[PDB]
Every structure is written in C-alpha cells, then in structure tokens.
Amino acid sequence: APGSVVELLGKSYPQDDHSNLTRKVLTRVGRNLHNQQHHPLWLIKERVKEHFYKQYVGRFGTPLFSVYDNLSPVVTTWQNFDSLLIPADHPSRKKGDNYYLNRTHMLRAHTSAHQWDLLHAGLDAFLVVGDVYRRDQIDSQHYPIFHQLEAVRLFSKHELFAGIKDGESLQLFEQSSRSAHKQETHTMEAVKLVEFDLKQTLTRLMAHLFGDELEIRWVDCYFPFTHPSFEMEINFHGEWLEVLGCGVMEQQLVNSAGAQDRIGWAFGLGLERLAMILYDIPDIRLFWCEDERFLKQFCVSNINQKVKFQPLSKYPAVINDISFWLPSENYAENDFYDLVRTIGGDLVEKVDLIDKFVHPKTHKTSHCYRITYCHMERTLSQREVRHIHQALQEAAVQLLGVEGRF
Ligand SMILES: N[C@@H](Cc1ccccc1)C(=O)O
C-alpha cells in the first residue's frame, strides 16, 4: 500500500508515526555536491583537507586525518543522538525538525552522527564531509539539505604535554567538578592546551581562506557532546554569523568508544555558510543549479584561487499570500514548508508566516503565509506562478488537511 514503506539504496524502511520524508528530499540523496569536482562546496572541502595535510603541526608528528566523504546519510537515532549524549527529551529530536525514515532510522542532521563509530574503529584523527538534512524555514539562507565538515582530533597524555620540560607530573584526567570551564574528569592543564590547539588551528584555517582582513570572534556556547564549547562567528554584511561549532569532546563519549587514554577536540563546519561568505554567493539555491553561468566560475587551476562569483541580475518576483484553517490539533509550520518545497521547488525564494489567529466561534486556528516566487535563473511568468500556487492550495487541503481561506 502507498506510504507503507520507503526504499532507498536497496534498503527498505517500514513507515510509522515518526516517518516524515518527502519524495522531494529523497531525490537529493546521493547528489553529493561536496564530491563534485570544481563545485564550491568541494572546493572548500579540498582546501580544509590541504590545511590539515600541509599546515597542521603535531608534536609527535601530524596525526594524518583520514577523510570520509561518501558515508550514506541514513543513520540510526542512536548514531545521530544517543551516541552524542543528546537527552531523550531534547528539542533537537523533534519530528518537526528532522527527516525520520521511521522511529529508528533518519537522514543524519549533522556529521557528528559518525563521531562514535569512527572513534570506535580506533582513529585518532578524521574528517567527515557530507550532506545533512533538517526540516526548516524557506529563505535564501536555508535549504533542507546542506553540507558539513566534521573534524575530530585526539591527543595522548605525553603528546599533549610534549613541549614541557618538567611535565611528567601533568595529567589529562582527575576526579573533580564540572565548571563553566571544564568537565569533571579533565584537568585544567589539559583543557587549556586542547582549547589552544583547537582555536589556533581554526583561526589559521580561516585566515588562509579569507586573508587577514577577516573579523572573527569566539562565542561560548553549549552542546551535549562537547564541553567547554564554542561557536566561531564571522562578521559579514554588518552582522555576526555563526560558521562552526566546536569544543573539547565529552569524555563519556570518548570513553564509550574505547579511547579512554585520549582527550579530544571536535568541530563541525557549515559548508554553505562558509561558501556564501567566501565566494559572494547570495542565495543557497545556487549550489543546486546546473547553470553553466554559475559552475564555470569555480573551475580553477589552484584550489586556493580567490574567486568572486558574479551574480546575475535579480529577476522579478511574484508575491502571493495563502491562508487556511489548521487541522484539529495536528500541524507544524515545517509540514507546510516541506509541501512548498515539493510543489514549488526552487521557484520559491522565501515563505513568511505573516498572521495567525483563533476564531472564537469555531476554536480553529488560521495561518496566513506570504510566498515569494522568484527564480534565480529566469523570469517566472504570471501564468506559471498561478499554476504552481493553485497546485499548492490544492495539495495543502489534500495532504495537510487544511481548510482553505484564500
Ligand atoms: N554538530 C554540531 C556542530 C558541532 C560539531 C562538533 C563539535 C561541536 C559542535 C552542529 O551541527 O551544530
């Protein structure tokens, strides 16, 4: 029966109460833009690889980062969440925000879903590069599929302290208390040196990519799988924008994988955000077009070329509002955004939820959304926008159970 199973790459996934993949999102699996020669996301991947191969120093010799850029994005919820100490009630698990094949399997929402497995295989240094998947809003800075680069680097005790003359007393581990600055089983000596290595390598990487005009800052933050943790923000177009999260790996995670004689750092870089800043790319949909006007601008002889995408003129937009009554107590905005992606695809530039109200006589909730139809590569005709918008109205009633207003 329709809707009972999803098949992907030869495997079958029975559908249940968690299942929420759209056909549209599934058609993106395997595209692997980060492996497409000359693609801007591939360019960033290659430049990061070169950084660690040529410009990262280790006191015992540079670790050698093995690179995994072709792992299937289908993961278990154990890989994506439990292995990273993400609590069962954590909002990052909500059905509204993740593409679940079912209660047990999902499309990975982050490349951190592979940390535990690669640590458990015994690696001390690795990169993971891949497409990741999240349910989210529609605008020029958000897409249901994007790409991350994960890095993990572990140190042994004498490796971390190798530059210290009287360092035989120094330890990685102790039994004390957790503070804002360190985990309960880490010494402050070890945390300071791991943090220094992590921030130094990331600063050097960004300085190479952007030059020394770059304005960056570190923001103290929280993740369940690192502590202390930071985000790096870059000041771009007058605002501070996060480009990566990182930190000192939680020792329970590292110990659980079998590396109890190691302390580590890890980071996760958003490739599209970096590429949009670095290359003057104004809209995330451009990564997904095959327009030779776009792809030819990144075919460079040296991966370190300072290319500046020259954008096309903006084409005219058609703006249409759409309003409906929500079903009785079963609806997420992201269900509508998924349907917009399904029907309108890359014709849709942005969707804003403008108005919401409750009607007293019926107790129903009305939403009104504003849809900006504007294509990156061509002028949309009024007629074709009308036909797409009509299809959207009809699909919302049929599939989401809404009752149309206008
Ligand atoms: N996985 C985190 C980023 C991260 C990776 C590794 C360590 C810390 C943070 C994210 O997707 O936002």
Author numbering: 10 to 415
Sentences from the paper on this structure:
Mutations in the mitochondrial aminoacyl‐tRNA synthetases (mtaaRSs) can cause profound clinical presentations, and have manifested as diseases with very selective tissue specificity. Among the recently reported pathogenic variants are point mutations in FARS2 gene, encoding the human mitochondrial PheRS. How clinical manifestations of these mutations relate to the changes in three‐dimensional structures and kinetic characteristics remains unclear, although impaired aminoacylation has been proposed as possible etiology of diseases.
Here, we report four crystal structures of HsmtPheRS mutants, and extensive MD simulations for wild‐type and nine mutants to reveal the structural changes on dynamic trajectories of HsmtPheRS. Using steady‐state kinetic measurements of phenylalanine activation and tRNAPhe aminoacylation, we gained insight into the structural and kinetic effects of mitochondrial disease‐related mutations in FARS2 gene.
